[PDB]
Design a protein around this ligand. Sequence first.
Ligand SMILES: Nc1ncnc2c1ncn2[C@@H]1O[C@H](COP(=O)(O)O)[C@@H](OP(=O)(O)O)[C@H]1O
Ligand SMILES: Nc1ncnc2c1ncn2[C@@H]1O[C@H](COP(=O)(O)O)[C@@H](OP(=O)(O)O)[C@H]1O
Ligand SMILES: [Mg+2]
Ligand SMILES: [Mg+2]
Lengths: 275, 275, 5, 5
Amino acid sequence: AYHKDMPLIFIGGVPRSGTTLMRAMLDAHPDIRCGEETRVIPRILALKQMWSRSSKEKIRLDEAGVTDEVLDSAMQAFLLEIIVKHGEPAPYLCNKDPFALKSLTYLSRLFPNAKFLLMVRDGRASVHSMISRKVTIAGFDLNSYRDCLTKWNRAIETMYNQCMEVGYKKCMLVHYEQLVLHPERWMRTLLKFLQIPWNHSVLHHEEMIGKAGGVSLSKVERSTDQVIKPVNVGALSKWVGKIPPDVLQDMAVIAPMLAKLGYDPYANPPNYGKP
Amino acid sequence: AYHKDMPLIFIGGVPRSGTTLMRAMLDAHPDIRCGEETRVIPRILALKQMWSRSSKEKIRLDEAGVTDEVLDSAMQAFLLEIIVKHGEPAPYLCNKDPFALKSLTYLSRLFPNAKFLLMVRDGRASVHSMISRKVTIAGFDLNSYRDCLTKWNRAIETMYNQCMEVGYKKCMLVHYEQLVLHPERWMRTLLKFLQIPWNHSVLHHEEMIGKAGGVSLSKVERSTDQVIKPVNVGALSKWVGKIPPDVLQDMAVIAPMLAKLGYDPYANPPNYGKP
Amino acid sequence: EEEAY
Amino acid sequence: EEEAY
Ligand SMILES: Nc1ncnc2c1ncn2[C@@H]1O[C@H](COP(=O)(O)O)[C@@H](OP(=O)(O)O)[C@H]1O
Ligand SMILES: Nc1ncnc2c1ncn2[C@@H]1O[C@H](COP(=O)(O)O)[C@@H](OP(=O)(O)O)[C@H]1O
Ligand SMILES: [Mg+2]
Ligand SMILES: [Mg+2]
């Protein structure tokens, strides 16, 4: 049984911000299934967004009878079929595709009882991650820290503004650094936010890897080698000393979302906190 | 009521091949609704086609549980929501999007009882039409008859091959020239092929324009001003004398599909027949 | 489009 | 792709 009013969970954020860890920890809950990145969801959502943004094209679709209500119904049907059928059934279905939250507000409209989790990491950590691990993302030039931080800023700002627009009952900012430093505190807050009862197995996601009602992984995903380990504070500040000095000097200008999201742009690194 | 096994009709072919006329003639049948070009259907089909052609990407989606069966279910749900909801309900639902039949074989698999009408027109007529009326198609350079006939050739070859692959019970080649020359003869053959009872109103499509259970037109579609008129043989050879002589000399080289489809590539024009 | 087709 | 994200 599935439908557009069911309680869905959408995890996202900029890649390399702990999105796989977030969904793996929730997957470890026995009544929740998220599963691996679908990939198709961001692309069809981005396609749909290109049609609605062009007022010229929007007129042509409305004249063909392909209205907002028709498109939304087709979008709903497509996304649910993917979300429901690509993994095992569960009381609480979940979806993790980082850039799906670029259409957060639109997803909130399509799915009224859906809740969102925007993963937020220090942009310098996320950018250093994708550059050092050679993670290829559309638009992100991995030779340039300046370019990647500029694209990180643009991406995270768009998702943040939408997260804020829907409000504190539909979307929740989840700070990666805080998640790893205080995993019990945050997972308890998160499940209370999602209105799902507590289960301690979310704090042992490593012991649920490849288990029935557990954490399904993809051998070709870039976060698989890290998520199989237990939750640790190891990746908080691996970025420090690796960014060039001209970029470090311009950091607040390049990435003003660092400051908005509680990261000191001139701390090398910030004091994220300690457990 | 609607489902993936329902008897669908997909009209298509290269733009400027009499596809609007074809669908309008069927829309004049009181039991058939086709409606306006959806526009989204070819684009989502094309998007899907890119994922399945790429063997690298096909591995990743399957590793994420987004298998053919999952994708095909998602596509079925999306395409049916557009087809059913964008127009008024009818016993026999139809869809006209010219380039939807670049995924003819795939649509035949997704919709097992769907029947296909591939409209074929003399490529010199289609190309001349799109150039003289300035009808923009992606990849077609309207400043070159040579480039347009080459792209025409590639498009029609792809759709023709898929039409012949699915077989005579699933797909019917419909020659525009033969339709306009002998409209009663061909509409009778078409409705027998579609297994829909004969109704003379298909031959009076101009009297069903904008009527209930009749022909619904889009004010920004490029065939609207011609389709409001009754069937005529006036557009058979408007191209003659308008194609440059270098392209005329190279006709069989540029467009070998002309000859494959029964058109003489050096007759100006061919003897299409007389009413 | 986008183009007419 | 296609890129990774
Ligand atoms: N079990 C775990 N504990 C802590 N961090 C983890 C983890 N599994 C994955 N991560 C972190 O999540 C980041 C990848 O996020 P995403 O899943 O959005 O791509 C990686 O950052 P680094 O690559 O900087 O180490 C990785 O360290
Ligand atoms: N009532 C009618 N009788 C004959 N041809 C028609 C017609 N309505 C439309 N057409 C033809 O369909 C062609 C456009 O096809 P499509 O709808 O597939 O783009 C046009 O060719 P021309 O532009 O050469 O005149 C047009 O003449
Ligand atoms: Mg689970
Ligand atoms: Mg009708």
